[PDB]
Design a protein around this ligand. Structure first.
Ligand SMILES: Nc1ncnc2c1ncn2[C@@H]1O[C@H](COP(=O)(O)OP(=O)(O)O)[C@@H](O)[C@H]1O
Ligand SMILES: Nc1ncnc2c1ncn2[C@@H]1O[C@H](COP(=O)(O)OP(=O)(O)O)[C@@H](O)[C@H]1O
Ligand SMILES: Nc1ncnc2c1ncn2[C@@H]1O[C@H](COP(=O)(O)OP(=O)(O)O)[C@@H](O)[C@H]1O
Lengths: 24, 49, 66, 49, 370, 370, 370
């Protein structure tokens, strides 16, 4: 998105949610 | 019960009258003391002027 | 301020606040109106959603009215 | 009934006097805050001079 | 009066600003004051003495940069006054200081004196109509569209974890440690001295910051990667030189997870997050583990959150769902959230009156600090 | 003005209420007032400063719990008023406090002031048309079909024994000790401290209750498991931690059978019942030994029936048949009995009108106490 | 055959020692373990890798101090083994553990694992012939020579009250909260961080402790003194700098009477004493309010007992004589009493012999807890 391009530093191409797997 | 109501109404109202007179008159004292400080500040400022 | 006017005007506008905010709540409770906020939340334009959830005095208004 | 009448009169008139003395106390409390600011002004006057 | 309020994030290394009601900070420039250290001879040279702003990066080979804010605490107050005036300058906002409510941010648990002095500046030099100082965490929750979470940020100089549950902040569970971006960059500078590059000037230090933001990356198991040689990235200096980094490209941001490397008994960032959770109650631990919100520029390291999951998972209880949300606008979460809170009427019912400040002073802001 | 009287089981551990005629109490929320502990910073947070029932059970960690009623005696009237207001609120009943008769139960042998102030609240703050105060023994007999029996209830705060024969209560044989579920939970807390697990917050006190209800049993013998030093069964906490217990999941509930452990000379629950039977008439012993009714939540422990039988069997004279009727509605028996009693028409004659109380006062309540 | 026993008085912050029959604990040293932080390079440096005793205080800046006993519960058994060996080392006692009986002291209401592991340590590592774990209140009563009293002690990590009347202890009226000197020191570290002074190093925590033990007093009226901006007294350092403490020198010791400042809901020290007396009998309260005996290190603040008298008057019933008897030996009262207890004749039969421990095991020490 352009709003997240116009700025100097942005996490481009990175997963946004870090979470443990299933199988509790 | 009605005479005890006489008691508590007189007690509460009059005591708060006393406490208000204490705070008010103490600030009147503070006002005269602070007015003396006003005179000192005007003296120091006018002297330097 | 109910220092002026009649008591009838007061009763009537309190009732009017009831039915008015009542219908306003009916408007808000519709799924499309909420769906717009859902789209905004999906687009992360949190200004509108947060301002709509806290700045609208509808909550305290409905409370005090009821 | 007369006891309650005269005591409602006493309690209400005493709380009216509470209103008067409380107004005077609040006025001078604002006056205290005002001369706090005024002393700060005169402090800046002495400082500039 | 109440015109459109202004949000200013005093990032200890990059100050972010703009008006409220906006959607992005259009005024982002690093936080310092660069004065020239050379001799003026040719008339018609650069303009002015101080060089705050983009002109600094444009002419960094002349300046002698000085940072005003170290570890969130302001040291050179005159520099912060110059920077704030530069925020209201003709190149940044053009408004007048007597026209907008100011939403200033602050790192948590900063000294009382910092708030007091900031109040003096904004109400004596600048004559703002209103002012409010808040935590940086709450703003990130506003910008991330949530209400419960543990904001674990890493600015350029202060990393901390604030666990907020349903809008209620738990002050006794706040953990703050002063080891962030500048320490990562400083440690990297020391490593380049040992690699034979001797960056010691001020402009050289910001070149180190550019390296840290571009060539470093975090580890997964520093021993698995320590026993094996790595990529050895070839970064090009603006001069045209060539530098190699080697294993220090992953050893440099290890300082965050372990301050023993810099010789400092403190906690890792993982320990800060885990302790901040465990300092709180018991009914909330599971929900706080499920909502970890990052922010702060020093969490943009590549391969960071994965190591954070392995670390916290190694520390948190068995099979608890740890869920870290890291958005793309982490760098401006505090600003965006400042814009969100400042675009409300509760903000009008939340700042500090100029008159009330004149009547009270420091006690006013320390009462309305939350 | 009356339509479906409101039955209220004013129990110190959990308040159970609903309308008359309802076979099951619709609302059974715990009896505590939850106030927040952590300051609200973020706007749009939870609203209000008083959390009752379902809300103060999900956001438990954020709260500090203050029990209003302790040992069947109200401490803070404000809190009880708020709980009763919660009962008539929108989320619970949506009714007015002027359109329904109110049956509010009470433990036996409570001080007169509880009856007085309870009616003052229900006749001054609430303009209830009809109020009737009952016993928490007769109602269990109603909801169990019987008319002759020994009601041995053990609520969360006060246990007692009331021998009722053919609808006639023998008030001088009422035994009552103030040692119940609260003391068991509190003593369980002390056992966890001796086992290394402390709990001091009020919000974590319910986790102690949770342990009690999910892991405590009663051994048939006090020494066949004492010196055995059995296994340590684990039990998970709400966060994901782990608690192994061992000698406390049976040592804590023996406080009911012997309160010497708490440091208070009194009689155990078995001695309460046996002394309540032995204080009655000589001819009425066999019918009371064969008609024992259980009620209250503390009578749900594992092995409670076997222990109660063996203790009574030791104290009762030889070969006397001892039957202990233990229904499955021990928590709601008193309420169901209230729903039965208020659904009758004799209840109309048994309550107290508003003008009755206005012309008389407390005297009218002590007149219709039985 | 038997010899003069050793009184190994524990403590959460200071461990006292000395043989029985003495009058002064000749070997006192802090209960912390210091190991080097930096890297040894030269040949002829300090050797040992673990430093306990005055040597650790001599090289505080070189060691990473860490306490192994937190809130009366031993957290590191290996470090405690090192500490107890240092007690029997050639610098403090110069004797053998196989030739002397041990009088160990423990705080009341401690977990059973501490007693059991202490038994295994003193009977498997040290081949002590006889061990007797005693309380701490009774010992201070022995030291003062009294027979009755409410011992209100306050160690480095545990404050507790044990009312004892005519030599008889009441094991159900013992209050115990884990909020004391070490926690007040941590709270003072927090206030100095709020004033603009960093003390994040663990070895610097000793400096924080010195600040607490030297420039802290208890104000009688708390908020009345909080409003008055004091002179901000200047205190030196073990560096040579100067710190302006200010208001954080009177509200830092207010944690003892207000645990809300640390965010933990519990009772105050005054509430501990009053509740420990109210939880006892009815006919035993005037004598218990009279004989109030203090002990522990934390009860040495300026105006401690004066504020204690004020608070007790706010909680004790009207017109009751209170005597907070604070002797000058409050720091070593438990050791003096241990010397008196071990120097008697019945002490021969009070302990647990080695053969007894070999026969039963932990059961023997659990039977002789009091
Ligand atoms: N892409 C990146 N990789 C690693 N670090 C970065 C990156 N971008 C920014 N940073 C670090 O973030 C810092 C910016 O600090 P910042 O988080 O903005 O402080 P604040 O958030 O308080 O304004 C920079 O100094 C840099 O060290
Ligand atoms: N399944 C269970 N097993 C054992 N004890 C229970 C169980 N459920 C509840 N309890 C205990 O019994 C109490 C139930 O309260 P209750 O007996 O209804 O008190 P009251 O009669 O005053 O309302 C709870 O507070 C809890 O202490
Ligand atoms: N002179 C003093 N003034 C105030 N506090 C003190 C003083 N001396 C010691 N303390 C506090 O008391 C603690 C030591 O108390 P102590 O009685 O040794 O506890 P314990 O016996 O449980 O180790 C120290 O941590 C310190 O915080």
């Amino acid at each position: 998105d352009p709003k997240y391009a116009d700025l100097p530093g942005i996490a481009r191409n990175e997963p946004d949610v870090y979470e443990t797997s299933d199988l509790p | 019960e009605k005479t005890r109501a006489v008691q508590e109404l007189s007690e509460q109202n009059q005591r708060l009258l006393d406490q208000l007179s204490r705070a008010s008159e103490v600030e009147r004292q503070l006002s005269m003391q602070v007015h003396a400080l006003k005179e000192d500040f005007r003296e120091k400022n006018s002297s330097t002027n | 301020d109910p220092a002026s006017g009649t008591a009838l005007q007061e009763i009537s506008f309190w009732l009017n606040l009831e039915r008015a905010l009542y219908r306003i709540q009916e408007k808000r409770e519709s799924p499309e109106v909420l769906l717009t906020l859902d789209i905004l939340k999906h687009g992360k334009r949190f200004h509108a959603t947060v301002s709509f959830d806290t700045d609208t005095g509808l909550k305290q208004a409905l409370e005090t009215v009821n | 009934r007369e006891k309650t009448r005269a005591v409602q009169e006493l309690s209400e008139q005493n709380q009216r006097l509470l209103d008067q003395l409380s107004r005077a106390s609040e006025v001078e409390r604002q006056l205290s805050m005002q001369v706090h600011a005024l002393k700060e002004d005169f402090r800046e006057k002495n400082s500039s001079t | 009066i109440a015109n459109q309020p202004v949000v200013i994030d005093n990032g200890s290394g990059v100050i972010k600003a703009g008006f409220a009601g906006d959607q992005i900070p259009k005024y982002c420039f690093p936080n310092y004051v660069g004065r020239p250290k050379h001799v003026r001879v040719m008339a018609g040279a650069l303009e002015g003495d101080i060089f705050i702003g983009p002109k600094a990066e444009e002419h960094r080979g002349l300046l002698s940069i000085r940072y005003p804010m170290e570890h969130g605490i302001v040291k050179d107050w005159n520099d912060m006054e110059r920077i704030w005036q530069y925020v209201y300058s003709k190149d940044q906002l053009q408004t007048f200081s007597e026209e907008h409510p100011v939403l200033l941010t602050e790192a948590p648990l900063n000294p009382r004196k910092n708030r007091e002095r900031a109040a003096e500046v904004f109400f004596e030099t600048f004559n703002v109509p209103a002012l409010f100082i808040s935590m940086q965490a709450v703003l990130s929750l506003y910008a991330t569209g949530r209400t419960t979470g543990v904001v674990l940020d890493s600015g350029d100089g202060v990393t901390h974890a604030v666990p907020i549950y349903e809008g209620f902040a738990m002050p006794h569970s706040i953990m703050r440690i002063d080891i962030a971006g500048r320490d990562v960059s400083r440690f990297l500078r020391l490593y380049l001295r040992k690699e034979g590059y001797d960056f010691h000037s001020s402009s050289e230090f910001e070149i180190v910051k550019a390296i840290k933001e571009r060539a470093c990356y975090l580890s997964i198991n520093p021993q698995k990667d320590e026993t094996l040689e790595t990529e050895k990235a070839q970064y090009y200096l603006p001069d045209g030189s060539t530098i190699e980094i080697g294993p220090s490209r992953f050893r440099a941001p290890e300082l965050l997870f372990r301050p023993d490397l810099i010789g400092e008994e403190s906690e890792g960032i993982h320990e800060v997050l885990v302790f901040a959770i465990q300092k709180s109650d018991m009914d909330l631990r599971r929900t706080l583990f499920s909502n970890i919100v990052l922010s702060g520029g020093s969490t943009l390291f590549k391969g960071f959150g994965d190591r954070l999951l392995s670390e916290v998972k190694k520390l948190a209880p068995k099979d608890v769902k740890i869920r870290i949300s890291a958005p793309q606008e982490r760098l401006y979460s505090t600003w965006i959230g400042g814009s969100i809170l400042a675009s409300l009427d509760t903000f009008k019912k939340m700042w500090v009156s100029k008159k009330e400040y004149e009547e009270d002073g420091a006690r006013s802001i320390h009462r309305k600090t939350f």
